[PDB]
């Protein structure tokens, strides 16, 4: 090229064009996939990443891992994006989505290198994706009985599957019961803010617990809080948005008096304002008082003398959960404290949980809320436990809304590879290669399972291809036996939407990455 006295773009513009640019995009995607490969499946491992602040994060969750990697490659950002999208729409499959997208790209890399027009590749991807999605919706098992015991069994198995990859697999049956107990209490929108997850360092995973009620940590008590009682056996609960303390009646308020009698009247007036609020709260019958706003030392001692319980600065979310659990309403005014707005539980307590003090409202039968209390030996231990439970909870919600299950261990992947191989053998011959490549790519899930487990993925995939071509649709990897097995009978169940969205997202990422033929980086402004 030539200098050209005046240049078109700003000096520093980096333009990568053509087949080399495309192959480099595919290679960057391969890197991103490798970064999460070893987390896939029951034999998957966790990753430790460290930030500039020096805080470490340990996770088996692919979305988390990729969020933490400071990926900057414009083409490799797309895998991060589709992992985020999977975590958003479904809550599981985040590693599978990245693996599938990268494997589609890897499989079409040879044809891309030999000048095959990308439009042809994206057409093939769209076709094979629609076919595989319709096939999942076709062979997905949806029990049409609406039986409750079978609908709890289904959710428990889907949750156990979603949890058989984490550091809580050795208690996953335990946690699965709780996850179901958790989502079977939420009302109809299955709000996640309605499930509380407290992390109390200290204790074992089996020491973790679910409270069908609410629980939250003690909140900056003043003097007299230890004079209060700490157990109530049928309390009525006043939930408030009220600051209970001697304060300026208003910030723009100015008192003006010209008499010492008026001075004393004003002092006593502040005191009577406060004492009137407290007396209304007391006469409502409430033996427990929670305020989203502070409760001063005067109010603390007042309630201690009346043998009531008070907690201020309660977080808004914990208050809303207390409301949905005990059955009251949050009051900014204490002037109408009817039993209609008070809440009620069978037991209130303040107990010690591993160095911390926690208030438990337990016994709420009308509870649309639950609170997980997770124990463990490290901040990141408990954080990854919470992430695992988030996967299980999202899985259980999606299953509740559509109990249409497929099998795992790569069973569904092998079935779709079979179906698409068959379909490709019936079409002209250009799309044949690309749809066969789609099929060969789908095999990355059982292959990676076998790899992470320490098997001979080749022999196992041979067994699977044969057994799926002989008749049989739910045969996949059996990890503890280093073999294959009917995973639908082994109860390796997976909501169909998981793999549906995985294929959709992976195919979209592949099509996007493959449609880009040029990358133009402008030079950074405000260089620094």
């Amino acid at each position: 090229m030539m200098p050209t006295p005046v240049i078109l773009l700003k000096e520093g513009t980096d333009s990568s064009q053509g087949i080399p640019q495309l192959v480099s995009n595919i290679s960057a995607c391969q890197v991103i996939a490798e970064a999460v490969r070893t987390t896939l499946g029951p034999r998957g491992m966790d990753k430790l990443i460290v930030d500039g602040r020096g805080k470490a994060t340990i996770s088996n969750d692919g979305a988390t891992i990729l969020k933490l990697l400071d990926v900057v490659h414009p083409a490799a950002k797309t895998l991060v994006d589709i992992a985020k999208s999977q975590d958003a729409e479904v809550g599981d499959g985040t590693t599978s989505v990245t693996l599938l997208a990268a494997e589609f790209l890897k499989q079409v890399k040879p044809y891309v290198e030999e000048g095959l027009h990308p439009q042809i590749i994206i057409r093939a991807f769209r076709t094979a994706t629609q076919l595989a999605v319709n096939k999942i919706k076709e062979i997905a098992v949806t029990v049409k009985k609406a039986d409750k015991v079978e609908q709890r069994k289904l959710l428990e198995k889907c949750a156990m599957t979603a949890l058989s990859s984490k550091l809580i697999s050795q208690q996953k049956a335990f946690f699965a019961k709780m996850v179901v107990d958790a989502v079977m209490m939420l009302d109809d929108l299955l709000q996640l803010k309605m499930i509380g997850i407290k992390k109390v360092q200290g204790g074992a995973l089996e020491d973790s617990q679910l409270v069908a009620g609410v629980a939250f940590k003690k909140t900056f008590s003043y003097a007299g809080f230890e004079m209060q009682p700490k157990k109530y056996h049928n309390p009525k609960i006043a939930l408030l948005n009220v600051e209970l303390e001697l304060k300026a009646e208003k910030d723009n308020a100015e008192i003006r008096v010209h008499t010492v009698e008026d001075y004393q009247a004003i002092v006593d007036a502040e005191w009577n304002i406060l004492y009137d609020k407290l007396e209304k709260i007391h006469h409502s019958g409430a033996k427990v008082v929670l305020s989203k706003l502070p409760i001063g030392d005067v109010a603390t001692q007042y309630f201690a003398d009346r043998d009531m319980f008070c907690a201020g600065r309660v977080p808004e979310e914990d208050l809303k959960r207390t409301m949905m659990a005990c059955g009251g309403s949050i009051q900014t005014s204490v002037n109408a404290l009817s039993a209609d707005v008070l809440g009620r539980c069978q037991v209130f307590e303040e107990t010690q949980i591993g160095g911390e003090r926690y208030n438990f409202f337990t016994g709420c039968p009308k509870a649309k809320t639950c609170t997980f209390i997770l124990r463990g030996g490290a901040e990141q231990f408990m954080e990854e436990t919470e992430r695992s439970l988030h996967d299980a909870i999202m899985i259980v919600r999606r299953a509740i809304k559509n109990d249409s299950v497929v099998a795992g261990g790569g069973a569904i992947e092998m079935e779709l590879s079979k179906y698409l191989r068959d379909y490709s053998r019936t079409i002209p011959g250009k799309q044949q290669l690309l749809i066969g490549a789609y099929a060969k790519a789908l095999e990355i899930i059982p292959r990676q399972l076998c790899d992470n487990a320490g098997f001979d993925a080749t022999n196992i995939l041979n067994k699977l291809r044969a057994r799926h071509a002989q008749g049989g649709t739910w045969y996949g990897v059996d990890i503890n036996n280093e073999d294959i097995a009917d995973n639908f009978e082994a109860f390796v169940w997976e909501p169909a939407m998981v793999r549906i969205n995985a294929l959709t997202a992976a195919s979209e990422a592949a099509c996007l990455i493959v449609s880009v033929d040029e990358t133009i980086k402008n030079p950074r402004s405000t260089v620094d």
């Binding site: 090229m1 030539m2 064009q17 053509g18």
Partner: protein, 538 residues
Amino acid sequence: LVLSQNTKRESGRKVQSGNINAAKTIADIIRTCLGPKSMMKMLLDPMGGIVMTNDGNAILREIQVQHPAAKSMIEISRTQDEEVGDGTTSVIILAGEMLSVAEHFLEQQMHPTVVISAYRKALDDMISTLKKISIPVDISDSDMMLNIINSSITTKAISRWSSLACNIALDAVKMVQFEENGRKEIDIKKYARVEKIPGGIIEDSCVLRGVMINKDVTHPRMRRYIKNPRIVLLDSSLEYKKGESQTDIEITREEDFTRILQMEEEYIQQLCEDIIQLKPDVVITEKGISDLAQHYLMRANITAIRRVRKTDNNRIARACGARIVSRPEELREDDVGTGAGLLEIKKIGDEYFTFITDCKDPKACTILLRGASKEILSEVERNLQDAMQVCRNVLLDPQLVPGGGASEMAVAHALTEKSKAMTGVEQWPYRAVAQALEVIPRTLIQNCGASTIRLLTSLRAKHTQENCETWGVNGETGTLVDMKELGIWEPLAVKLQTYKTAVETAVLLLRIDDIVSGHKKKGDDQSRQGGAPDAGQE
């Protein structure tokens, strides 16, 4: 890493368009230096020198570039200058135009090999058409040769003194013509030296029937004017020098030092006697001459000149008809040089100059240039080299071709007419290379300050008739003329070499799609060239 950090690599349409643009830039540098109305350029050498010229090779030779395509174009100009000695701008412009019309086809999805095949076909047919429209010439017609040389200098600054320069070049080339042992030769490079003495007037510049050197007598008693000098040429020093071996002497006797010094003097006497045996008038040496040797030669009434360059001595040999010798004992009358008619040694300016300038049948000459300054005389020398190289090209291949772009238009028409039968996919590049030949008339018209569109249209139309292969442009009036009426006739060799170089470089630059740069030489051991064995060869 895999390749070095300094290793860059470009590839694809970017490289192609970049090479073509570099070539087009080289062509735009010297596009205005074409024709009889060209303008001069004053280039500044890195040695503080100055070069005023309208010579394509001079310009592109004083420029330096870093793009390899531009390097290739400068090498084009060098090749054309060395081969034919003219066309150094026409070749560059034609290569630029061909690369442009190839950029047109590479923008589309045509492969460069297709363009190259079409270019090779077009070159074959250009050659055929040039040989078909050419005419012969009787090289014995001095007026014809002078007009041929005028058609080559009319474009250069010495066009003002045209009869003079033409006669100079013609006389010089005709004299330096030499046949020996059945092998014809000209060799304007080694003989026909151009010596330019700044000062005087250019109209007094002349070609001598002999040679001239910048030397004086060794002793002021020598003659500076001899009217029938017998001349001897030597490669050996007329001094007493050491031997090749370790010849250390050992003296014990008193008479031995004096006897050894007298032995030296007697050796010098013996050399000079070997010389005087042949009775020469002038003795010319490439090496030195001792003062005692001067004494002996002077006693013999011999004028001696020393420390002459080997090339000058060879020219003197060719001029006066002598054979250079290295051992005076082996001197013969067959080696003595008769043929010179006058040796003179005259003060030109403040410098003594030796002339041997009345020779009969001199096979070498000296063109004595006189003028305003060193730069002006350097330009005159370059123009004279053009003229003499053209005269030589003619004497070798006496076929003539019309100029003014007439040949370019005739060939363009012939190729356009042959392209109709093609009916393939190479007809477009073929017909582009045919219409790329018109950049010569076009450029000419531009340098006149006339209307390219109208004139080139009228000319393209004229050249479609039957007997119109000779119609072209008048570069001083901006009109159309018959070349047999104007007089601008180029040598067929010049045009053939021009077209060939242009087409071949277009081919060379179209075959390039990738550039790897920055890598090191990997060669430091005294610049390894060829030293190695092979597989037997018996």
